[PDB]
Design a protein around this ligand. Structure first.
Ligand SMILES: C/C(=C\COP(=O)(O)OP(=O)(O)O)CC/C=C(\C)COCc1cccc(C(=O)c2ccccc2)c1
Ligand SMILES: [Zn+2]
Lengths: 315, 401
């Protein structure tokens, strides 16, 4: 019998007979309260009763139902969430019905930490990940960048080894929004935990894919950061053709991401004993000034540092 | 004003004629911010960057005693409200009456658990976030009464109860793990001098695993790089003297790339929106990186400025983040809150004050009454409060048990 907190006929707990026995413990904020919240009558009411059943550690079906109201009033109250998990095990509640509950409240408050941690605890208990990838995808269909949703997805995939279809999902969302950095992150998570980037074929496939994306949306920073992120590993100088190939977009797809990526390639050439060192260095410093003074002035302090540091190093 | 320069209009997003939810939302923000920048021109007034100190102060001093039910969602984060407010007042150079101070000390005493650590309100189970907040508040107050509130043996015992085999910390018992818990722990243990030899064993390594392909740090290994988690990860490493466990260069490149060329403020993660609270979590990283690279004896480091555009940031915060009624915020159109007031103010102070040994270079945009008290980049409380607190607790020895 769940009388909705939103129900037009919802009645205070104090105005409820099946509760009458238990006396409500109010909140002790002290004789001189600070950052004191002027609670609503409903908030105040449910919490005085929550306090009471908790103080007496009453593990009843009635207590279980009240926590739900206290959670809806403040989903961030971790103490209530704690007692609720206590009662889920005592009363031996159907954890599948509880998965239905948590699915509903996460849809309502997807940016809350507690709701997601609770779902994780339920999946662990039931050792059942069957609904996860689908539920999470519904949340990402509403906010494709929800950090918690992506974190939960990563945990389910790693714990239960559900890697097989994630790269396909990633391709799906990248089509939807090639600028979704959470998806570029998911791409790296899947690849690094399956094939890895040492496989030259994979690396080739990834560097080519990324290059096409850059062609389409030259100013999409995510594709650029992913390109840097997977090559930067082995050293950008380890790839001779790349410098060439980017020097070509110079007039066509020449955003300040291309400019910056060139200073990155040069930086690594200098560190790895490149030919024409005097030459390469002046270029990297030219780009560093074009960036600091013209193309990327918001980062002038960075680009100057890069200039100085580069000189100090390869003078 | 850097933002109002004509050449600045060239910084507007270039969507390559390929619209996605990302470009469309960014565009809406730039449009909104542009209307703010150009308001002066459209009304023919001379731009006056003025931090509304008195407005911010009434809002703060009022919230420190009571709040409407809009704050019911923060009923489990009360020590946070104390920290945010007391810290904001502190930056505004507003002193805490001995009477208010004792009230706060008494309150946090009610939030403190008999098993160490603090809860989000009187009687709530302890959790690391409010524990960090409670301890930071008490240090801002800095009295012997405040310091005495903290039961150091139960606190250390509590941290041990959250310590994990892999080096991480749970946020609370039966709770989750992420880079924030390590920072909350390193912060309260260092300030209170309860760091034993094995307490943070393997923590620097676990945090280092949180650094990803982007240069930034995610909540847990594998996660997208975020400004809030990156500050926690690096600040925690500075406390542990292990900053070198990170690839500081890729991190430096990542954080600096988070400043929005147009808005001037910082975004939380790549391809997301600017937000004033990031004036601290992201910009606050530069002072930390400065210290670390300088510790490695970096010769190219500036002697007068942080490695981000301090001017643009101060302009975003001042023109775009103050609420006329008092209080600061995320971005134009957003509602003011004590969290954003604390971090917009915190990030403003970081933008105004530079320091690297004997070097001290301020940059205050607008009316010089805009200069705020400096803030320690690791703890985010006044530098004096940090020295004062650590010096005090160093009179006590680390709990042996
Ligand atoms: C999910 C997310 C960011 C994603 O948000 P999103 O809305 O998607 O924004 P963006 O688009 O800007 O990323 C994480 C943001 C992390 C931050 C801001 C780190 O702040 C420091 C800190 C220290 C200690 C505790 C906290 C808490 O916030 C806390 C709260 C409750 C319990 C315990 C601790 C924070
Ligand atoms: Zn914010």
């Amino acid at each position: 019998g769940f009388l909705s907190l939103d129900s037009p006929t919802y009645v205070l707990y104090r105005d409820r007979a099946e509760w009458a026995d238990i006396d409500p413990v109010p909140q002790n904020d002290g004789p001189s309260p600070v950052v004191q919240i002027i609670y609503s009558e409903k908030f105040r009411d449910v919490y005085d009763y929550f306090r009471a059943v908790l103080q007496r550690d009453e593990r009843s079906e009635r207590a279980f139902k009240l926590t739900r109201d206290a959670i809806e009033l403040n989903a961030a109250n971790y103490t209530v969430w704690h007692f609720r998990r206590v009662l889920l095990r005592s009363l031996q509640k159907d954890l599948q019905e509880e998965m239905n509950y948590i699915t509903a409240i996460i849809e309502e408050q997807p940016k809350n930490y507690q709701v997601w941690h609770h779902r994780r605890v339920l999946v662990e208990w039931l050792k059942d990940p069957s609904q996860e990838l689908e539920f999470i995808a519904d949340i990402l269909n509403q906010d494709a960048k929800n950090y918690h949703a992506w974190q939960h997805r990563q945990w389910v995939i790693q714990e239960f080894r559900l890697w097989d279809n994630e790269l396909q999902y990633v391709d799906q969302l990248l089509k939807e929004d090639v600028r979704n950095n959470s998806v570029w992150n998911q791409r790296h998570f899947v690849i690094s935990n399956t094939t890895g980037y040492s496989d030259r074929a994979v690396l080739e496939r990834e560097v080519q894919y990324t290059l096409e994306m850059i062609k389409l949306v030259p100013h999409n920073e995510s594709a650029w950061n992913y390109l840097k992120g997977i090559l930067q590993d082995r050293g950008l100088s380890r790839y001779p053709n790349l410098l060439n190939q980017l020097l070509d977009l110079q007039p066509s797809h020449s955003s300040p991401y291309l400019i910056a990526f060139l200073v990155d390639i040069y930086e690594d050439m200098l560190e790895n004993q490149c030919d024409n060192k005097e030459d390469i260095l002046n270029k990297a410093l030219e780009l560093c000034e074009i960036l600091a003074k013209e193309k990327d002035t918001i980062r002038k302090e960075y680009w100057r540092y890069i200039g100085r540091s580069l000189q100090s190093k390869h003078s | 004003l850097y933002s109002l320069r004509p050449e600045h209009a060239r910084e507007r997003l270039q969507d390559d004629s390929v619209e996605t939810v990302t470009s469309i939302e960014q565009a809406k923000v730039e449009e909104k911010i542009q209307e703010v920048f150009s308001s002066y021109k459209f009304n023919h007034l001379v731009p006056r960057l003025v931090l509304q100190r008195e407005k911010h102060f009434h809002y703060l001093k009022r919230g420190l005693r009571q709040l409407t039910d809009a704050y019911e969602c923060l009923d489990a984060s009360r020590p946070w409200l104390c920290y945010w407010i007391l810290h904001s007042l502190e930056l505004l150079d507003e002193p805490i009456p001995q009477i208010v101070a004792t009230d706060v000390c008494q309150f946090l005493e009610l939030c403190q658990s008999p098993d160490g650590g603090f809860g989000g309100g009187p009687g709530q189970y302890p959790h690391l976030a409010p524990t960090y907040a409670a301890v930071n508040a008490l240090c801002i107050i800095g009295t012997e009464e405040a310091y005495n509130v903290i039961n150091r043996e139960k606190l250390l015992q509590y941290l041990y109860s959250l310590k994990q085999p892999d080096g991480s910390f749970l946020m609370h018992v039966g709770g989750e793990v992420d880079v924030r818990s390590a920072y909350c722990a390193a912060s309260v243990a260092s300030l209170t001098n309860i760091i034993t030899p094995d307490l943070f064993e393997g923590t620097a390594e676990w945090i280092a695993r949180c650094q990803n392909w982007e240069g930034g740090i995610g909540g847990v290994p594998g996660m997208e790089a975020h400004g809030g988690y990156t500050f926690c990860g690096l600040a925690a490493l500075v406390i542990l003297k292990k900053e070198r466990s990170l690839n500081l260069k890729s991190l430096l490149q990542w954080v600096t790339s988070r400043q929005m060329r147009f808005e001037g403020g910082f975004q939380g993660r790549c391809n997301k929106l600017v937000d004033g609270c990031y004036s601290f979590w992201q910009a606050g990283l530069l002072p930390l990186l400065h210290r670390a690279l300088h510790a490695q004896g970096d010769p190219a480091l500036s002697m007068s400025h942080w490695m981000f555009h301090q001017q643009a940031l101060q302009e975003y915060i001042l023109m775009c983040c103050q609420c006329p009624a008092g209080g600061l915020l995320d971005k134009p159109g957003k509602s003011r809150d004590f969290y954003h007031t604390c971090y917009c103010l915190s990030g403003l102070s970081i933008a105004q004050h530079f320091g690297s040994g004997a070097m001290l270079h301020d940059v205050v945009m607008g009316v010089p009454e805009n200069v705020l008290q400096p803030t320690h980049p690791v703890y985010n409380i006044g530098p004096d409060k940090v020295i004062q607190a650590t010096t005090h607790f160093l009179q006590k020895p680390v709990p042996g048990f």
